[PDB]
């Protein structure tokens, strides 16, 4: 199995991990901050997804330094993962296009 496929495969795994970990850590970091809503795990996971995909609807978000730091890591991993998938696809199309040209 080529690397772009294997990497794309890994990116997925790590992303899911980042989501779970970021969910856990967001709660740990936000409880204790008056008025924070990112304090229960189920909605904390939803928040992590909507952040990683960059949808960010605005229903939930961190107010503390650490919550925002955790948030950045989720953002980055999310943009990179989906972005790496794009890389793999391009690589996939390139290879086959070369073949289609007899190369």
């Amino acid at each position, epitope marked *: 199995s080529a690397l772009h496929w294997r990497a794309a495969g890994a990116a997925t795994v790590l992303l899911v991990i980042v989501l779970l970990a970021g969910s856990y850590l967001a*709660v*740990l970091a936000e409880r204790g901050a008056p008025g924070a809503q990112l*304090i229960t*795990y189920p909605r904390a996971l939803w928040w992590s997804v909507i952040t990683a995909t960059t949808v960010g609807y605005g229903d939930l978000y961190p107010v503390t330094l650490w919550g925002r730091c955790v948030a950045v890591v989720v953002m980055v991993a999310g943009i990179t993962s989906f972005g790496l998938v794009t890389a793999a696809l391009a690589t996939w199309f390139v290879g086959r296009e070369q073949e289609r040209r007899g190369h």
Partner: antibody, heavy 118, light 108 residues
Framework: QVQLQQPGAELVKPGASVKLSCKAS????????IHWVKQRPGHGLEWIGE????????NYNEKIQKKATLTADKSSSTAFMQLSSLTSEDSAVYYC???????????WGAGTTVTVSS | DILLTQSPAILSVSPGERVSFSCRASQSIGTDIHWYQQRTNGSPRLLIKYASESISGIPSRFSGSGSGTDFTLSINSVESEDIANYYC?????????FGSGTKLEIKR
């Protein structure tokens, strides 16, 4: 079986401190939070604080005078609440509770009636 | 800090009659509300979670409803054993808070 075991009573002289416990049994998860609730005779329930055993962090009520200090023992599955420099004003029932990190108190301990007298 | 107002503080109802307790949050909180029943000398016990979700062990007689700011805990055909104090509790914003409570009195 009783998920949370709490001592029946604790007599404390004014100015002294006491350390309440809360033995936990049953299913346990890294996302569990143990809350403490004060209730004086004839009155409502007051949120005192909380702590997450898996990590060891605890938060407290900012609307009241901090008298408690929460700790946890992962090996013995026991949560402790240190109350210090108590006065009659601190005489009440202190309940411990378990929240699966989803916002509600699924189970409460029987409660420890603390009396502050000489 | 969300203020949960429970009024009236006491509710007199006749046997087998329907009753409804009220709990109003100072601000909107979706359906992040939990109801507890505490009998004389008894420890608090969860009745309804997230405004209307049932709980195992609890009688189908108990029901919940509402969203936003106004929540209601209902009981169809109240019987002697329902006598106790009732509290709502929010988990929408930190820190979690409790309503002052409503006592249920039965007029036999």
């Amino acid at each position: 079986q009783v998920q949370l075991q709490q001592p029946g009573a604790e007599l404390v002289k004014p100015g002294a401190s006491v350390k309440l416990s809360c033995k936990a049994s049953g299913y346990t998860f890294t996302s569990d939070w143990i809350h403490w609730v004060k209730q004086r005779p004839g009155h409502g329930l007051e949120w005192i604080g909380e702590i997450i055993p898996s990590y060891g962090r605890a938060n407290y009520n900012e609307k009241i005078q901090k008298k408690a200090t929460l700790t946890a023992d992962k090996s013995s599955s026991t949560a402790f609440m240190q109350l210090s420099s108590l006065t009659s004003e601190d005489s009440a029932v202190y309940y411990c509770a378990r929240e699966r990190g989803d916002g509600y108190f699924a189970v409460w301990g029987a409660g420890t009636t603390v009396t502050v007298s000489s | 800090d969300i203020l949960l107002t429970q009024s009236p503080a006491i509710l007199s109802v006749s046997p087998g009659e329907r009753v409804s307790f009220s709990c109003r949050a100072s601000q909107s909180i979706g359906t992040d509300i939990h109801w507890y029943q505490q009998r004389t000398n008894g420890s608090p016990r969860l009745l309804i979670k997230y405004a209307s979700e049932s709980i195992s062990g609890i009688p189908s007689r108990f029901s919940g409803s509402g969203s936003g700011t106004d929540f209601t805990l209902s009981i169809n055909s109240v019987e002697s054993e329902d006598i106790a104090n009732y509290y709502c509790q929010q988990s929408n914003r930190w820190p979690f808070t409790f309503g002052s409570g409503t006592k249920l009195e039965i007029k036999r």
